[PDB]
Amino acid sequence: GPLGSMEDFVRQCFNPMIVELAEKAMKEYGEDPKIETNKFAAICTHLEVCFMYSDFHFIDERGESIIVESGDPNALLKHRFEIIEGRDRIMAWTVVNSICNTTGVEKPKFLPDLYDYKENRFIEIGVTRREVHIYYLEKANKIKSEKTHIHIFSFTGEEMATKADYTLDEESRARIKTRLFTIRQEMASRSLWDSFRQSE
Numbered sequence: 001g002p003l004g005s006m007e008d009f010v011r012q013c014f015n016p017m018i019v020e021l022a023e024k025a026m027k028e029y030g031e032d033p034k035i036e037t038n039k040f041a042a043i044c045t046h047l048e049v050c051f052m053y054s055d056f057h058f059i060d061e062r063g064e065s066i067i068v069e070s071g072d073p074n075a076l077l078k079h080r081f082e083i084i085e086g087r088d089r090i091m092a093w094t095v096v097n098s099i100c101n102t103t104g105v106e107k108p109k110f111l112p113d114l115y116d117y118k119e120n121r122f123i124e125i126g127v128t129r130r131e132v133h134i135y136y137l138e139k140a141n142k143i144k145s146e147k148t149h150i151h152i153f154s155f156t157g158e159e160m161a162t163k164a165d166y167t168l169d170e171e172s173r174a175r176i177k178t179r180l181f182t183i184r185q186e187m188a189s190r191s192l193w194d195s196f197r198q199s200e
């Protein structure tokens with residue numbers, strides 16, 4: 001079929017909030033979304049997975065973890081996750097320092113993606129177009145800090161997580177995998193996938 005533009009794919013297939021946050025992130029690092037387009041799409045995808053990982057997960061009045069998918073969570077519930085990704089560098093470290101001084105949890109050396117108030121740990125989310133194990137190993141080597149939990153998704157449904165602890169229920173992680181499958185399939189119909197995959 002005809003080759004589409006990755007720009008078009010991104011703007012048509014990700015929520016505008018995600019696209020804007022990705023643009024802001026690339027600007028901050030001196031990267032042009034209109035030239036590093038596979039990167040733009042990868043940044044959107046990862047950001048979306050971070051949001052999806054956190055979506056609908058609360059902690060109840062009794063202090064326990066619950067899932068609320070209706071868009072009307074009662075006011076006494078607290079979000080289970082803090083989202084660190086998507087924030088500019090100053091605000092991200094501000095949020096991390098806050099958590100670390102509050103919870104007593106040690107300070108990471110690089111910004112992680114989420115903080116889990118149930119499991120009391122930072123999470124690094126990975127999304128890879130390669131084998132999850134190789135990618136798990138790469139993230140781990142950069143982290144070097146036994147505290148941060150790593151959770152890797154691929155575009156083909158494989159996951160790998162620290163100590164085989166997957167944090168979330170199967171249905172939550174299936175939502176993420178279904179979304180990644182949808183992204184891959186749509187890129188493929190626009191003849192964007194092979195390149196996108198190979199560029200990692």
Ligand SMILES: O=c1[nH]c(-c2ccc(-c3nnn[nH]3)cc2)ncc1O
Binds near residue numbers: 040042112199200
């Ligand atoms: O885990 C994170 N990953 C990424 C990410 C950034 C760029 C790319 C990329 N660049 N060129 N192609 N892809 C892929 C992932 N950003 C933040 C993360 O926490």
Ligand SMILES: [Mn+2]
Binds near residue numbers: 085111112113
């Ligand atoms: Mn990150």
Ligand SMILES: [Mn+2]
Binds near residue numbers: 046113124125126
């Ligand atoms: Mn990440």
